[PDB]
Design a protein around this ligand. Structure first.
Ligand SMILES: O=C(NC1Cc2ccccc2C1)c1nccnc1NC(=O)C1CCCCC1
Ligand SMILES: O=C(NC1Cc2ccccc2C1)c1nccnc1NC(=O)C1CCCCC1
Ligand code: PRO
Ligand code: PRO
Ligand SMILES: [Zn+2]
Ligand SMILES: [Zn+2]
Lengths: 482, 481
């Protein structure tokens, strides 16, 4: 790895993702191969998220990837927003299909006619379904692996309710889980918030979101979303039920949908990645500790060196640490050091003959570079500590970054200045589509746009305060965006 | 449930898949919704299969759904066989794409240019990759949920090796795991075989397979496949390495591919289903035991009855049995019986006021129907024991069916007779492409070759003739899905 993060980011990213063996390029643009090293991160995100939504009563399922023209261009607004970026299938082999079929950009239009069939009374609710699948949004903006791709893996949850109370409860429950994924697993702090009128999910009542900041970009990125759809969809798809306690009055279901994707891995790369390459937080790292023999003159002494590598491995397995021992003899110690640094392994455990004699090993923390000489009988205690402290450090540094590039401005002039150093700004705002488009026009002379309206904003808004422009309604976090 | 398995099978199947809440229909022909109850079975297969391939050094990954037209055509025998069931994306919104992009029917031509890029020497071998994903084969043939669909979920494993010895070892390892899924997980007997020339995977050298028999229709079905691709693909995609032994000579990689699908769930339905609905082999059942409070009266006794089911629950969880206590006051005991029988749960645990006070319960086995009054002391014993007997029973039952519907026919005339009683026959067969086409024409609806069984029923005697050409091998032939 030659390229440096501080100067050229695009070249750095492309080198980091390929040399870590996370990503290979495909001949179709906007499409990327997720290799084992990347896919394992997603698998850890899944193991956690799945277990958590199961407690909330959600069940896993699989719906078809194809939507009919009828199901789609039946209902407006939602379909109106996605329409341009929907990939259409128009032939099998040489045979033109009589009716074009669409690839899923999201599964509302696929799921809800099935929900309408399954809802026939109050006791068929709630319906709480999730799926792990691929989705396609065939946009032409500059793609980047993980962050911005045409095909991507996600989960999508869709729940339908008798009462608004249960639905509103679920939206926030889910949004906290998405925040838990970013802060606990990936050591990325997030701003919980609400989307503006312009940015909200097309058909829905409201949209909650977690935002994260990428230092080197000077840009922010939506990292997860939880919608309340209200009854907008239940009315369009006739998901209705009678309740004999409200005679005759048809009750349209209350709905949420929620989504999280492999963008999660890209954000991780952007935040914690350095000039040595990938940096894995221990909690998602599929290899937490890599054991490497050094000094490798007798056959018996090399055998014993290998054995001490295996002892360290088994001990680490016993305190629930994910450990590989690179005992391959085709490559030098120095080659392996660089190989596993690039891949982002939290801890490299060096074992040489002189250190065996001394009853020590070297633990090399990937975040700090910290060469630490550790006593042999403390491996478990100290590795754990370093591991959990690597997590805490990565979170601390990224938090410190966040409350450094997230600041408050009250006027258009002071918004403009702060913004062009690579920062994100909470400004007083009136929430108008017109007022938001104008901001984008002016702020570009790479235009800036809104991110979220935070649940815990930095300041309270003054009684009678004018929007950075009609009076304001809330502080709205704005910025340059992915 | 309205239809009877033996009078109208399709209607029966349609009723069992929907009434058990396994399948919903979609508005596109050939595409089906896998609801929770079906998808849980796939997840049990996945848990089993993933752990097994990880021991073999295989890793999970995700390659794109889309193939460029150049990549897809690179291996010519492969492309031609698949080209007419390939779905092509030609636009996004109104915005036409510069170049029509194809949806994967299998990932060979997606993955292998990446494999060429990754192999720079023999130290980069082996590559062993697997993915769980959906694929699309847009066939106009008559569709059937699980068994025969346009889009389905599967795993596809793709490995590349330096030597042919390494690759042939894996082909059979994977097939043995496929056999374990059917036999150990689904309590379905299978026959391990090799495909014929007409039926082998188009790009490859040889295809190993598993066949399962479905009594009710008299038809066999391909359960999964494991192909040795040889060097046919590595030559086309340039997956090459050198050896410092003979400097300057390129060796092409030896390749395998292997797939298994959600067809598994349909085969299980077809084999073990009855006129009371689905029957679940406990080994893949997400709910092994359902506890239903019966005979529902004073609230203290009514709640002590609820209290008894929860003890039965907790004591069952404790010996790692998958249990549900259906303690909803919304639905009558009778409704609960029917609903969990339709979903095919292995044991119904009936707790009624009278039997609770007499320190017992009823356990109702789903497979045979029988009801056992069982003392409360022997719960975790008799219930673990019962789950284990149901697993064997279903296997034995389907095994005895196979041992009775697979037989030997040594002439073409008596091949016809045995075949028309809804049987599958092992014949002496020459192996040739047209003699295989001829077996289909004359038997119509036609009967096709399923596999050449690793271990046929009998020994092909000194210079035996075929059904046509002398007999090269005994071959399992039948009416087919
Ligand atoms: O949006 C994405 N791509 C579109 C934007 C873009 C840019 C350039 C070329 C193509 C495209 C398509 C995307 N790509 C990868 C991972 N994740 C994504 N979205 C999310 O994470 C969102 C948050 C959660 C719910 C779903 C959206
Ligand atoms: O073959 C299948 N579909 C095609 C045939 C057909 C029939 C009617 C309408 C559409 C189509 C498309 C299919 N469908 C569902 C599940 N599994 C399948 N194949 C397998 O299990 C085989 C064994 C494993 C490897 C892949 C093939
Ligand atoms: O596309 C979206 O954003 C919503 C959330 C997941 C499912 N659909
Ligand atoms: O389609 C097939 O039969 C092979 C096996 C899985 C990948 N390709
Ligand atoms: Zn304004
Ligand atoms: Zn013949």
């Amino acid at each position: 790895l030659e390229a440096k993060k501080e100067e050229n980011l695009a070249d750095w990213y492309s080198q980091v993702i390929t040399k870590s063996e996370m990503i290979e390029y495909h001949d179709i643009s906007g499409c990327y191969i997720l290799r084992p090293w990347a896919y394992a991160i997603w698998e850890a995100i899944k193991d956690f998220f799945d277990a958590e939504i199961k407690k909330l009563g959600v069940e896993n399922c699989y719906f078809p990837m194809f939507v009919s023209q009828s199901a789609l261009e039946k209902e407006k607004t939602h379909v109106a927003d996605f329409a341009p970026e929907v990939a259409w299938v128009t032939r099998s082999g040489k045979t033109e299909l009589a009716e074009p079929i669409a690839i899923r950009p999201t599964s509302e239009t696929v799921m809800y006619p099935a929900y309408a069939k399954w809802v026939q009374s109050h006791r068929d609710l709630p319906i709480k379904l999730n799926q792990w699948c691929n989705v396609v949004r065939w946009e032409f903006k500059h793609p980047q692996p993980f962050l911005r791709t045409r095909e991507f893996l996600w989960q999508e949850g869709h729940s339908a309710f008798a009462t608004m109370e249960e639905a509103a409860e679920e939206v926030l429950q889910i949004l906290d889980l998405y925040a838990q994924v970013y802060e606990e697993l990936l050591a990325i702090p997030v701003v919980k918030g609400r989307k503006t009128e312009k940015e909200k999910f097309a058909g829905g009542d409201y949209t909650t979101t977690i935002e994260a900041f990428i230092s080197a970009s000077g840009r922010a990125i939506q990292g997860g979303t939880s919608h309340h759809l209200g009854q907008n969809f239940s009315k369009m798809f006739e998901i209705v039920f009678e309740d004999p306690k409200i005679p005759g009055e048809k009750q349209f279901a209350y709905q949420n949908s929620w989504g999280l994707t492999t963008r999660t891995i890209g954000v991780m790369t952007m935040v914690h990645g350095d000039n040595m390459g990938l940096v894995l937080p221990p909690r998602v790292a599929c290899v937490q500790v890599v054991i490497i023999p050094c000094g490798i003159l007798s056959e018996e002494d090399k055998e014993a060196l290998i054995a001490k590598c295996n002892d360290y491995r088994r001990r680490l397995l016993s305190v629930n640490i994910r450990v590989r021992a690179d005992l391959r003899d085709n490559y030098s110690p120095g080659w392996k050091f660089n190989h596993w640094e690039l891949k982002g392994v939290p801890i490299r455990l060096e074992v040489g003959p002189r250190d065996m004699k001394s009853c020590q090993f070297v633990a090399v923390r990937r975040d700090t570079g910290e060469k630490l000489t550790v006593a042999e009988n403390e491996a478990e205690t100290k590795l754990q500590a370093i591991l959990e402290d690597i997590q805490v450090t990565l979170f601390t540094r990224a938090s410190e970054d966040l409350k450094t590039h997230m600041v408050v401005a009250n006027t258009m002039e002071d918004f403009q200045k702060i913004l062009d150093s690579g920062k994100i700004v909470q400004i007083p705002f009136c929430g108008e589509i017109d007022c938001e488009d104008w901001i984008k026009k002016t702020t570009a002379r790479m235009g800036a746009k809104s991110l979220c309206i935070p649940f815990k904003p930095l300041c309270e808004l003054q009684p009678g305060a004018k929007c950075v422009c009609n009076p304001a309604k809330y502080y709205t976090l704005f910025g340059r965006s992915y």
